[PDB]
Amino acid sequence: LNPESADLRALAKHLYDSYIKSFPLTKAKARAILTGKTTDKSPFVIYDMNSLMMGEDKQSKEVAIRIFQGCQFRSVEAVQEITEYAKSIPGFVNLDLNDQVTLLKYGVHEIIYTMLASLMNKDGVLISEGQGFMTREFLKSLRKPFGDFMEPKFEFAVKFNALELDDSDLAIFIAVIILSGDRPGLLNVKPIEDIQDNLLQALELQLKLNHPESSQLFAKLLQKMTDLRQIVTEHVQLLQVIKKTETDMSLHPLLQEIYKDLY
Amino acid sequence: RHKILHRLLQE
Ligand SMILES: CN(CCOc1ccc(C[C@@H]2SC(=O)NC2=O)cc1)c1ccccn1
Secondary structure, eight states: OOHHHHHHHHHHHHHHHHHHHHOSSOHHHHHHHHHTOSSSOOOEEEOSHHHHHHHHOOOOOOHHHHHHHHHHHHHHHHHHHHHHHHHTSTTGGGSOHHHHHHHHHHHHHHHHHHHHHHTEETTEEEEGGGTEEEEHHHHHHSOTTGGGSSHHHHHHHHHHHTTOOOHHHHHHHHHHHHTOTTOTTOSOHHHHHHHHHHHHHHHHHHHHHHOTTSTTHHHHHHHHHHHHHHHHHHHHHHHHHHHHHOTTOOOOHHHHHHHTTOO | OOHHHHHHHHO
């Protein structure tokens, strides 16, 4: 290790520590829960309407809506955690505040679906901080339009999880996503690109040191950033459909704010 | 616009 590499290791560590502070349920813990390698009770499995209702004992709108709005509630909490994490990225809070807002607005869902993969396997997803496991099949079975809203997220996840990143890798990756200089409407791109340049260098070194056997992991990971955007744009279209067809529902105000003039 | 995010950022 040389002095520039050292500064990059320090940045990696600083981000890892902020990540652990900001995000209560890590991929480490999630994996422990999913494999069974934990001394906690295994999670309650939700695979049908009945199991759901018995698990709720751990509103009274229809099931698909209750599930969809539980996802909204989780995002709202996730946005708060991501906002706190973003504030720890060196140089972030020194940006024009309008640009901080724009970066968060466009970054949060990409990060949400990234971190959701940490909680997923090919059969289902941990919920309620790992106290539950909701099956992929059950989510597929929901009545249209809700029946296939999770499928693109699971398909992304199985591919993304094959990279076998850990929390120390994810912490840098997430910061890279937030510091994207090509978000629409940014006022001053230069200081954002300067920060992202450093982060990307930090990520590349991190991946070389933590995964020395996995050649071109850095390049595979950068291509996923493009796939995350697709997940978000498609989701926006699904939301448009849902907003037209289900005037039962109401989007949480934080989410209205994020989604307004997003794509 | 972005009243909440502003708030979370400045908090
Ligand atoms: C399927 N799970 C795990 C969370 O799965 C999520 C799926 C999608 C999102 C994105 C939300 S949903 C929306 O329209 N906008 C958003 O930001 C957020 C979380 C459930 C289901 C019920 C209760 C709690 N957890």
